[PDB]
């Protein structure tokens with residue numbers, strides 16, 4: 004029961020940490036995972052007829068700089084096996100009443116969207132001391148400043164188009180920090196085929212007996228006797244020189260709350276430092292969610308792999324923008340316009356057309372908080388799911404030269420065979436999708452507190468513990484490498 | 498004759514400087530201009546049937562932050578005049594063999610173009626700075642690094658597509674600094690209608706008797722008796738407390754040469770300070786050119802106002818990229834290919850503005866770059882040769898825009914007319930490379946250039962009395978009309994406040 008290093012969590016951060024420790028000659032380590040599987044928020048599920056889908060992470064982002072992707076790419080150069088596809092495409096944008104709205108010669112929405120993004124960059128990325136605000140408020144500020152140079156249809160539709168950013172963060176635009184909204188992407192993203200192959204390679208790169216599944220860690224204690232004690236729910240006790248904690252930010256947040264009996268919650272003694280505890284006030288957790296619609300066969304146009312459905316907009320909104328004297332006045336007018344039920348048209352949805360990129364007759368749809376929570380709470384009511392998404396699904400088919408969807412879950416018409424829904428908001432070992440900023444948040448606080456450790460022996464890794472690739476699989480992966488490398492170096496000094 | 502301020506040059510920098518002096522109550526100033534007109538590199542010309550075109554600057558750039566543009570926009574709110582139109586559009590890209598190549602579900606050229614530009618940003622914004630190279634060299638590196646993630650057609654057409662940036666700098670991709678190639682476009686640009694209204698509104702805002710046209714300044718002397726003496730070509734001598742020199746960088750560059758006989762050259766006594774002379778080695782001058790094609794009427798598709806014809810590309814290039822081991826071998830393989838013809842309309846990218854969609858005028862405004870510009874400008878009076886040169890791209894554009902080949906109807910006596918076909922009526926060409934008072938288009942970076950040196954040396958002045966304004970003297974809006982406008986305001990405000998305080 005005496006270990007060099009114990010890693011809590013077998014997601015990509017934990018797996019890479021173990022892989023790195025082995026690579027550096029470190030022996031007698033343990034990876035403790037609460038689930039009966041490795042991978043954490045990397046999970047590939049099976050659906051209709053053995054079709055595979057990533058229900059967690061699915062893209063390699065930032066392929067110009069992503070060190071994890073580059074490893075996959077180099078392997079692919081050496082054996083010629085396909086591990087990923089570049090599915091970056093020209094976005095189709097769909098409004099309920101107007102239909103297709105992308106690449107329009109009069110609307111030119113993509114062009115004003117870039118100006119909007121330039122506006123956002125200029126608001127923050129030249130200055131210092133600028134107050135943060137919601138993404139919604141930033142768009143309203145843009146419209147107010149540029150209305151003289153925008154058509155009515157541009158004012159109506161542009162705010163709904165730019166909300167695709169909600170699906171980068173997993174948050175509604177009024178919940179989302181403007182300051183953190185517009186980050187740069189370092190090149191195209193590559194769709195993983197699939198992430199389980201990445202997980203399995205890393206998992207196989209260290210001794211297989213290090214791994215302990217179905218092992219929920221319940222407490223971690225530092226005796227002044229240097230060593231760290233790790234208590235598991237099964238009553239097992241371990242003693243380690245070092246400890247790398249990779250549980251999600253959301254699960255870690257449970258430690259600073261009194262209720263002990265929460266699933267996933269780790270009791271720290273001595274308690275997590277105030278800098279760590281206070282950092283939870285300045286960073287939050289988004290809820291990107293996924294729904295997979297599996298069809299019998301593709302009878303729609305494969306013009307694009309990328310399709311976004313726009314939430315409904317109004318002409319009354321345009322009149323309000325043109326008539327408002329200032330931001331404050333704009334806020335008042337929009338409130339009185341507001342004063343129904345959430346539908347599939349209440350928010351933007353991002354649909355990936357897998358038929359074009361992978362040859363599979365399915366759509367992978369991304370949704371955001373607060374929709375994600377409501378949908379995941381009914382993930383087993385398939386009739387109710389179909390009735391909710393039916394209007395957007397039918398509008399999509401229409402715009403893709405096809406016809407209305409037929410419910411075949413129990414000609415050239417699309418037949419829906421199965422629906423798969425994510426569970427991240429309800430799973431106690433993830434409790435949401437990934438770290439995300441509300442207006443006023445400062446992610447650098449958490450990253451600093453996390454990467455400086457609780458003490459020299461108690462360390463942290465994971466998507467929420469690093470700057471580059473923050474929120475992303477490659478950031479989690481790098482953070483794991485980081486902590487293991489540090490510990491490797493300290494261990495050889497003995 | 499004794500003057501408070503003498504301004505050399507009546508371009509927008511010089512005009513705004515004079516406007517500013519008058520606005521702040523300064524009297525007895527002079528604007529000495531070598532040409533028989535004001536406006537400098539702002540010039541609106543008249544063509545077929547009274548159609549007007551800006552043959553110099555035509556866009557308000559960076560409309561999010563452009564202070565000249567924002568003043569224009571405020572004026573239109575005030576007086577109901579149309580001064581501009583937003584003509585940013587989705588680019589139509591045309592290759593001679595394949596036809597339209599834009600927004601293509603297989604090629605997706607715009608997407609990898611975006612990636613290349615991100616690659617460029619990453620290349621020159623790491624903490625460790627790197628050596629500059631040509632835009633060409635940068636593009637090749639991208640292809641060599643990213644070939645695993647690019648299809649054959651992407652490798653073939655992308656490098657031709659990206660060369661649209663040649664028409665922003667007025668420079669061939671092998672002549673252009675990669676470091677300065679990708680800069681920030683702060684919002685959409687607005688097409689001016691036209692820049693002559695801008696010139697007239699500033700020109701009319703100071704006393705007309707301040708202006709002296711056809712007045713070439715030949716020397717500027719700072720008497721150790723403290724004032725500045727300005728000598729003109731005709732022999733007229735002037736004395737001033739302050740002088741604002743706004744002649745182009747290309748003309749100012751002549752001052753380091755000894756032969757006084759060079760047209761437009763100004764003799765400085767004492768000579769331009771070493772920090773100024775040295776800055777000329779770290780900045781150069783591009784040659785953006787223009788050709789206007791005027792048609793009888795629009796019989797082409799108005800899907801977009803923005804059209805770019807790509808220079809010819811080969812599948813052989815793709816094979817070379819796929820088979821190269823490193824950068825050195827890639828250069829050798831390309832240089833052999835380059836060794837194994839004449840210059841044509843397909844030897845370089847050309848940027849065509851379709852004025853019919855944005856302005857309702859049945860004409861195209863085409864932009865060209867060095868080395869092509871000076872060659873075309875040299876034959877500007879030979880319409881039939883001009884037509885013959887551009888005929889293949891004009892025809893390819895018409896086909897791609899659902900029309901027919903172009904008819905030469907440039908001679909009125911011939912009574913040429915047609916319904917279905919595009920009838921060319923007139924061709925207008927710029928002359929900025931052969932005009933001694935411009936000698937090119939605007940400041941531009943060769944690889945290794947650092948424009949900061951010139952801007953600093955210019956903004957600090959030759960001394961307290963001898964100041965500089967113009968597009969080449971300012972960081973924000975460098976090269977641009979609004980940079981020149983702001984620089985004029987800058988030097989005049991400085992002098993004006995100084996004079997007020999006495």
Ligand SMILES: Cc1cc2nc3c(=O)[nH]c(=O)nc-3n(C[C@H](O)[C@H](O)[C@H](O)COP(=O)(O)OP(=O)(O)OC[C@H]3O[C@@H](n4cnc5c(N)ncnc54)[C@H](O)[C@@H]3O)c2cc1C
Pocket residue numbers: 011012013014015016017035036037038041042043044045058059060061062063064218219220221249250251254266267268269291292293425427432433435436437464465466467474475476477479
């Ligand atoms: C829907 C969705 C889509 C995403 N899309 C992308 C994408 O396209 N591209 C991308 O790069 N990233 C994406 N992400 C983000 C990415 O998945 C995360 O950044 C990354 O998976 C986080 O990995 P991690 O190792 O840091 O944490 P995890 O992968 O969650 O691993 C932490 C492990 O700790 C374990 N654990 C928790 N508590 C205990 C305990 N008490 N005792 C023992 N073990 C415990 C958990 O079981 C978990 O497996 C997406 C995420 C979601 C949810």
Ligand SMILES: Cc1cc2nc3c(=O)[nH]c(=O)nc-3n(C[C@H](O)[C@H](O)[C@H](O)COP(=O)(O)OP(=O)(O)OC[C@H]3O[C@@H](n4cnc5c(N)ncnc54)[C@H](O)[C@@H]3O)c2cc1C
Pocket residue numbers: 505506507508509510511529530531532535536537538539552553554555556557558712713714715743744745748760761762763785786787927929934935937938939966967968969976977978979981
């Ligand atoms: C083809 C072309 C297209 C362009 N497109 C754009 C565009 O789209 N948008 C944009 O913002 N800018 C554009 N520009 C750049 C823009 O025109 C310049 O940045 C701006 O006009 C410079 O003005 P200036 O007053 O600084 O110099 P100028 O306008 O050249 O004025 C300097 C004056 O000095 C006078 N002079 C020279 N020598 C003497 C002398 N020896 N004695 C007395 N007077 C002398 C000259 O006659 C000249 O009129 C373009 C330029 C060209 C050439």
